[PDB]
Amino acid sequence: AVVKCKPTSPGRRHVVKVVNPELHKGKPFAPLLEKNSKSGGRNNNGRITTRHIGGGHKQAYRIVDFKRNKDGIPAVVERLEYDPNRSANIALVLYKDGERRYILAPKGLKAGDQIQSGVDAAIKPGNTLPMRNIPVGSTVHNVEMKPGKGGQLARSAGTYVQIVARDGAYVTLRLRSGEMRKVEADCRATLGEVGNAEHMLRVLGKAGAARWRGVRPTVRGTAMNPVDHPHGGGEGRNFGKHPVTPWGVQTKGKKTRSNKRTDKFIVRRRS
């Protein structure tokens, strides 16, 4: 559920929260945690590598089973948690053999539901299955990319990949982006839309929200001086340049894409 705040103070007036009741409250499941440590966008050289990174809350890591094995063993999802390290939401799951794990959290999610993965596995929202045994048209969660690897496509709140054809020993997939891309078919993948989707509607509302979220401000190129960034200068405002990156690298449609080593797998580019 999304909520508007009363304007008892500018900077709250525009806030729009997304508060989910069916979320667990308080500390997570201890054993599936581990350190994290911020990086200030900085290198192993100590150099800022990616700008705008730093500050923001503490953040301990939830393991989150991406491969989805435990074939045959069923599990019952005890609860849905909040994970600070993704837009997605989290399911604490518990298998019949007495083992707990974290799983993403489909659209249907819901504590009490039953879950299972493997070649057998019934096609039901929330289950994992090599795509070879998955009706063409299904909508499917976090999709592996190499059979076995981990799943990487459609991991984000509201995302989902539609299977559009499975000729050959490969499947063609309509990613969220628009692109259509073949993949190994023996490749795992969970049933259903990834959860939440209300994400999209948050508003933040004041600079601090992003601040306490690890996003330091961005200073336009025009604001600076000729010696810092390819833009900037001119007595007042101005521009008269050819829109480029601070390293003079040209912008505004240049693609940069360059693989050849993976072209094959791309059947039709986004638009």
Next chain:
Amino acid sequence: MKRTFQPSVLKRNRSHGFRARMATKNGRQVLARRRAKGRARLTVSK
């Protein structure tokens, strides 16, 4: 006003102490040069 030299011996020893000097090709070279000048205190100690 708050001046530039705020003392701290941990740091002092870590930035310009004997071993830090001893820990890198050029550091050692700093020692060489000084010993060759006949300096009485290579590095600063107890």
Next chain:
RNA sequence: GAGGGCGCUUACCACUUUGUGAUUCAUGACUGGGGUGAAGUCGUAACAAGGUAACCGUAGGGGAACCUGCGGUUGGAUCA
């Protein structure tokens, strides 16, 4: 002495003052529309099937009447 009067004091209370509001009348640089006028200038929207049938409401566009979409009505002509 008692009683009264004057004086003083208290209560009510007209002027009068201070603040901030409602409200009505006159007026105001400029300015929207509306009414009336003799032959002006531009086109010709409506009237006949008015030469894109007309209108109502709504919205967008345009020197102008008006154009265009959307739905609705017939207060529409033909043997369609």
Next chain:
RNA sequence: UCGGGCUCAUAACCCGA
């Protein structure tokens, strides 16, 4: 622009210079 024509007649339109 000018002369001729179409029109009841102006314009448009057509013709000739």
Next chain:
RNA sequence: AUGUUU
């Protein structure tokens, strides 16, 4: 298209 004249 107009005629107190596109």
Next chain:
RNA sequence: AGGACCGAACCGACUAAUGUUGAAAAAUUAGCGGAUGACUUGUGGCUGGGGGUGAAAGGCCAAUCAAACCGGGAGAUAGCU
């Protein structure tokens, strides 16, 4: 609840007077802004010079920064004084 209100500490530094061989190589004094936050601070760590860092002023990088300091090439050159 609040980058909410008033207001000490603490962070700042808008005005004025003084000072300007100062008490001080940037202060004092009377006022001033913020003050649960993009808050403020101790210790320790990382980034190194055409490079870092910058809510961007060419601001900051050990009292100096349109390219630091130290040594070296070096007795650079100087149709100038």
Next chain:
RNA sequence: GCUCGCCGGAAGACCAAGGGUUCCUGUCCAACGUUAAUCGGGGCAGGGUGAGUCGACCCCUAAGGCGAGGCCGAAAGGCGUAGUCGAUGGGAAACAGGUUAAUAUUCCUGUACUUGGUGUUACUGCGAAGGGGGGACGGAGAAGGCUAUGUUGGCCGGGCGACGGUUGUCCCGGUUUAAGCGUGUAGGCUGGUUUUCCAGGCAAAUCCGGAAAAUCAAGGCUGAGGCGUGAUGACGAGGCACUACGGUGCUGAAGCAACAAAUGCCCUGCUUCCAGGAAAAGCCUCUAAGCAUCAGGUAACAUCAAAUCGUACCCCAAACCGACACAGGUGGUCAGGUAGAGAAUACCAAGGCGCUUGAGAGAACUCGGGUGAAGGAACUAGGCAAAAUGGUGCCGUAACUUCGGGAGAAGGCACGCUGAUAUGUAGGUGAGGUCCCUCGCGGAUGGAGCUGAAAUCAGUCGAAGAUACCAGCUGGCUGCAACUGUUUAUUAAAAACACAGCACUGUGCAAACACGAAAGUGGACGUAUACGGUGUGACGCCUGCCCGGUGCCGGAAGGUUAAU
């Protein structure tokens, strides 16, 4: 030595960082001290820093650093695995009193505690670089309980007053007591114990996870404080003696209660929110390799040990950073009284101080102040600076508005003292006495005593009752930016930057991008509701035409065109 003044959330008192003998005692004064100097943080001598339990080493880990081999690199060397270091963070133990010219949770007295070896004696499956558990954690907020701590009375010791009064509802002072041990409360949390079964916990496990039945309702962790004990003591005004007038012995009263009360403690709790909130060891338990009369495990008691190094002094400064005994800078801890909302402020206590030139004079002028006739912004670039406002409760309060606001708008009224209601009220706290009871850190009933605002009425003094210090001036029109925020440390704080929101645009993950000749690494343990680039800059109403030029995107048919 007697007075006078100054700070008292410091100008006191402790700690760290830093200094590094400034500490204490003699002695000296050239130089150092902005003067003198007999005095000093000066000179010279001599003295002084006592630990099982305070700190450090040590155990453990963070960010980060190093790093056998290894991967890269013309060389130098860059990176990194096993590891190994690294505190600002986790890990066992002591309190009060006394003492020295100077040390003391270190010496001394008193009274405790920790963990290991040995020994003896009873009882017993012990055992890992390993599993689980624990350690282990955010923000804000709301009380309840409690202590530190204070007031008053009671108590005790002393006093009966330089000038009217003062044997009393009078005056002064003190009224202190730790760890540890016992109890295990206010209160917080969680249902227990049993047996059996298993595709998990890199192997096993009697552990943790999961599944079944069984069977009990009270059980188990947690926990400030109070009380008892420590205390037969210590401390304690003051006595009485000696004094080399510094002090040294010996001695010692009272030592309670009620009330108030933190920002500390119960509380790493509780309620709740989103930004979702270290690691590892010690520790508890679980097995394995194994040892199986052993050894080890438990407990009581006895004994031995607990090294080493730091320990003076300064500390919001004359001892540190500032060239100075420099109006600057500098992290943590404590928090008495009266008044007060208070860590503001004003006066004091304790404690420390009057700032290392002094003495006179009492001009202009300058500095910093106090008061001002009439006038009151005429001054001036400009009301710069002054002067003014200045508390609390209540009444009351416009346009506009994003319905919060604007508003502390504005503007008014009350404000001291005494008496009364009421020899001190509503409230608070709360003992006897009474009863009960799962019996006591119980409950119920009881309302003594102790505490104590506010209100109305009557009365009263002054020029004036928020009386000092403290302590918003208010109102109308308009530009710019929505706003909190940031910036030129040292002439600019702004209308500049940033911002939430908006758009364009790139990127399919070995991503685009970025640091790096590379290995590696950031992006991201993320994955198009994400991440980078650019412009715009809340929100409302909106964002038209132009693709010629430049830029960018797609396109090949031809013309041209490189090495070859």
Next chain:
RNA sequence: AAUUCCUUGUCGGGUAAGUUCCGACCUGCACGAAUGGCGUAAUGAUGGCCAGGCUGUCUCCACCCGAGACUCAGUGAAAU
């Protein structure tokens, strides 16, 4: 107009008088749509203007309390 040169444009308002301010005109030397346009409650140590209060800011100074300045005594500089 943070943009208007001509410019103290012109009219209205406020003033005893107003190169500023406010409202208007539009002839925009040389606004205008994310180089964002035009609005906008709140906010601002923000630029411009007006009013009450207040005043030594002033007409126009006066007195007074402190620190220097002046005399004595010790030390004892500087720029040039």
